[PDB]
Design a binder for this molecule. Structure first.
Ligand code: HEM
Ligand code: HEM
Ligand code: HEM
Ligand SMILES: [Zn+2]
Ligand SMILES: [Zn+2]
Ligand SMILES: [Zn+2]
Ligand SMILES: [Zn+2]
Ligand SMILES: [Zn+2]
Ligand SMILES: [Zn+2]
Ligand SMILES: [Zn+2]
Ligand SMILES: [Zn+2]
Ligand SMILES: [Zn+2]
Ligand SMILES: [Zn+2]
Ligand SMILES: [Zn+2]
Ligand SMILES: [Zn+2]
Ligand SMILES: [Zn+2]
Ligand SMILES: [Zn+2]
Lengths: 156, 156, 156, 156, 156, 156, 156
């Protein structure tokens, strides 16, 4: 089915977002794992998989709409060197992708691509979930302090 | 069976207490849950259910005694903004309801409504239980300090 | 995540609707139960739980959007004294809440809060279900007459 | 253990009440059964057993308190000739026994026989239950009319 | 295998009958379902499936006899607005299709298409069954009156 | 619940689309089955059922919105005489129904019938799926040629 | 443990290779899936996962050797527009990565990083496997011709 060109661009753009998220989350996961923060590796790893499912959904959609998925361009990774810095980076990224999702969803609706819209809304719901988690951890770090927070990540 | 009017008023009054408790506990639960204090959400949620069972018991009793359960009037909620403040509020409330229960129980006995009395005593036993729990948490917060207490609520 | 203020007000308003529904349905349930209309107690009770799940959804959402859930204000309960009157009251209430849901959903979409919107649409679908049921019972009462309808509620 | 004499008299008196209830309920049960009102035979039969458990409790208590259980004197049975009349009789009887229970309970407390009291309160709770049931059936008969009520008792 | 042309026309004609029956029965089913007459929705729905199996049988037969099944032409639906009217319509339709089946069966035999005949006879046996059911319900409505009949359809 | 009239017309129109799809797909299925293309009969048959579930959804919705489902009018079937021609016909039909779904969805949203909208979106997602399948088969026929394609349908 | 700097560069370089392979294989997989070549989607998808396991191994190794895994730089994807072209591209890529692996393995041995070496050898064994598969498919396409090859990918 020939899709709307601008919807495809959006889908590619969003795809692009998930592909930076996928890498940044996986690196973070294995950084935490290395440091022995087993619990943070577990969650961020599972978030990496999450972003991958998203990427796949865009890819299959672009192909269905007869567009060319762009996995060539990779946006800026921002890794960070300590837990806070790195959580905070993941959150800024999820925040930028939500902004992009909000725009794309609106546009899909206005060109009547309701199923792309529908898939985008479910994705944003997942993103909003990741946002929740990042915010919560970042706040726990302040309430209980960094040392206690770190100890709390040692077991899975 | 026509019940004693004043017993019905008491039962309504007590019902009224449980219905503020139900809401305050549920809000607290989901506040804790949002903050990531999984353990406190678990307990306060289960206390919300507890107060609901109580409310139901009064409702069925008032109806049996041929009175009109009043679910219209809702007493003052006091929510609080941090764990201590909020635990402390739940405790003041349980304390006021116990006082009311003590009064009502005495009166039921003196008009010979022994089964209302019996149901009230079992309820107060549950309340006293909630009082125990609130007091214990509040004391743990002092003994181990707030940061360690918070870390201790992260897992269920 | 800071939500849109007016979306939060809507969410609180809707929350407020569910909290009257929760009480009115529960009272009705136990009123029917008392009268021995076992079947009506079963359904309205299960509708009470239904409205509670809704309330919870709003609460967790308002908290996520960083607003303050208001469980303090309770709208007007209208109880009624016989089956019809009471069914008819539940229906007027579901009807007012659907109207509010329709208004809120539109607004969520226009400020791009697509996930609040999404949760609201699923809720309205449930409400519309309750509307169906109330309408159906009210019509059965006319087609088969009140006496036969009452007999039909004696067993679960 | 030598019990208080007046407590024993009360226990005997109450025993006496259960033994009329036992017979009246059983006769009613088998009257309903004969008429084909299977459902009413089921409940009243189970109430007969209920009263028997009560009788047993008094008997074992009187014997423990070193009194002589009197199963010789049997109060006035009032049978009735149709469903209503007969339900209405069972209800007047439960009502008289509740009155007696209330008096006895008060007295047990004042001579410090707290366990007799305790057993009496549990019994009265059961009685109050039977009262509920009789009242409910009697009201169903008015709401739905006698013919529909009778049809509703044909299956168990 | 080249079939007899007139047999194919008959098969198409009969097919045509089943395709009105299929729709009329399904609409009726969901009309009853909507009204809360759960029991009538269950049966008419299962009759819709029944007619579909019939249609399929004709279709596969026409194709085997090398004819073109006509699913394009749809006879007159007669829906009705109340239970009786609608049952009575389903019955007139089954009656017309039985008449057509009787004619077709005779003709198949006389051109030696014994297997088409055989399949038609089994179908007519099913139809005759549906006729039985419709007649019986229509008579129950008179014997027990409409109100009692309606109550009797509330549970499945 | 009284629905918006134009929404009902749309729902009827869409219903009408599914009812041509149901027949065309079933005929195609049994045409393939007859030709021994077991694999195509399996899929198109399962698509026929799919369209039937859709029809049912519209029917129950129209009835809920207090409209009259029209199963009387049947649009133009286009059958075709060979695999390609017939696949190509099914695709043109799915394409016209998607167009209609897109218009109806927009309109539902603008009159606030969000649940009709919601059901329509899920349907369109299924349709879009059928579109995918038809397009894919049509392209396989070109890539691998007709003879190889036919052989590939012989087993299920 | 501080690793040898040049070993880390190699590990990063190789990592870089797996991350182009991961994307190219996944796109290919879903391209085949879209075209209905179910069998090729299955294998290339499983090769994508394979390359991901590899990437993970490098990442955990670089982190253990105290280096910074570079997931930022992404080499040139070469996608292709038909099966052959695309298989042929995957093969050229596996061939370049094997060359790099051979170089790195030698160097690891000469600086005594025998475990990095060991992990690299196991990886190359997997790569050599993928090479085998690509070569085999490419040859089957010539022996049996493109049409027959395509038909052979339709089922999993
Ligand atoms: C380039 C950095 C990546 C790394 C290090 C990585 C790592 C992993 C790992 C370790 C797994 C678990 C293997 C398993 O399923 O058992 C996995 C699963 C998966 N990956 Fe990736 N991945 C990456 C990128 C991608 C990309 C770009 C895609 C394509 C959208 C993708 C798609 C998938 C899918 C669909 C699964 C299966 C999920 C499941 O069912 O568990 N990955 N990945
Ligand atoms: C208005 C604020 C309330 C909220 C947010 C709330 C929430 C909940 C939730 C989430 C559940 C679990 C659902 C389940 O049973 O699986 C529940 C259960 C229940 N609620 Fe409420 N509730 C509220 C008020 C009430 C009231 C006023 C009553 C009536 C006395 C009530 C009676 C019950 C009962 C009987 C259960 C079943 C307990 C069980 O067996 O688990 N609730 N409530
Ligand atoms: C007129 C041509 C039709 C034919 C030849 C046909 C054929 C069939 C067949 C063979 C089945 C399988 C029976 C089973 O469920 O075991 C079926 C199922 C079904 N049909 Fe039809 N059908 C037709 C039209 C319709 C229509 C107009 C509706 C109403 C919307 C409908 C609704 C259904 C439903 C709800 C099922 C059950 C699906 C399931 O759970 O498997 N059909 N049909
Ligand atoms: Zn994502
Ligand atoms: Zn995310
Ligand atoms: Zn309580
Ligand atoms: Zn309490
Ligand atoms: Zn609700
Ligand atoms: Zn509702
Ligand atoms: Zn007794
Ligand atoms: Zn009794
Ligand atoms: Zn038939
Ligand atoms: Zn029939
Ligand atoms: Zn459809
Ligand atoms: Zn379709
Ligand atoms: Zn590799
Ligand atoms: Zn490889």
């Amino acid at each position: 089915m020939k899709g709307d060109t601008k919807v495809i661009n959006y889908l590619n753009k969003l795809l692009g977002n998930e592909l930076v998220a996928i890498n940044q989350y996986f690196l973070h996961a294995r950084m935490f794992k290395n440091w022995g923060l087993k619990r943070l590796n577990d969650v961020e790893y599972h978030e990496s998989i999450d972003e991958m499912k998203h990427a796949d959904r865009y890819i299959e959609r672009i192909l269905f709409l007869e567009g060319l998925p762009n996995l060539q361009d990779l946006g800026k990774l921002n890794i960070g060197e300590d837990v806070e810095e790195m959580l905070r980076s993941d959150l800024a990224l999820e925040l930028d992708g939500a902004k992009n999702l909000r725009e794309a969803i609106g546009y899909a609706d206005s060109v009547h691509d309701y199923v792309s819209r529908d898939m985008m809304i479910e994705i944003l719901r997942d993103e909003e979930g990741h946002i929740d988690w990042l915010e919560t951890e970042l706040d726990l770090i302040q309430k209980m302090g960094l040392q206690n927070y770190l100890q709390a990540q040692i077991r899975e």
